[PDB]
Amino acid sequence: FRVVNTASGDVTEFVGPDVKLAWDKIPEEEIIPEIYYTLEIYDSQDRMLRSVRIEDVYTYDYLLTYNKADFALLNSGALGINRKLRFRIRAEGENGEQSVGWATI
C-alpha cells in the first residue's frame, strides 16, 4: 500500500495533483469469490472524508477535483483544499468481513 507519485527525496511528499494510490492483490483472492476493496479517506484532525468501495481495480486515483470540491465545501464548508491526508484500505467480501486488513497506514 503506497503512492507511486511520492517525491523522490521524501516518501511523505507527493508532487502531483492527484494521489497515484496503488496497492497489492490479496494472495488468497483466487479461492475467495468476488471481492471488493473498501477505501477510506481521512481528513486532517482525524476526520474521515469518504469510504469508497473499489473492486477489480488495484490502482486508485484521487483526482484533484475531489480534494478541491468533494470535501472543501462539504466538511469544512469553505472553498479550499487538503494537503495532509491519510489513506488506508481493506479487503472484504460478502457474507463476512476481514478486519485485519482494515488496519493500514
Binding site: V15, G16, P17, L64, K68, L79, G80, I81
Partner: protein
Amino acid sequence: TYEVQGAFYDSIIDSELLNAQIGINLSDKQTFKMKSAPRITGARCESEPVDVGVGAPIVYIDTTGEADY
C-alpha cells in the same frame, strides 16, 4: 508606484485556486515608484573657450529625467 506580492505555486493550485489565492503562500509587500522618462527643457549654442583662433560651435541641452544613459 506599484506594490508587488509574489509566491510560487505547485501543481496542486488550479486556476480557480490561483485566483482565490487561498492555496498559496503570499510573500511580503514591496513598493516602488516607476521612473520618469527624460524630457529636454532648453537648448543653446556657445563658442568653444579658446585662447586663439575661433572656437568650434558647442551646443548645450538641459534635461530632467531618470534614464541612466
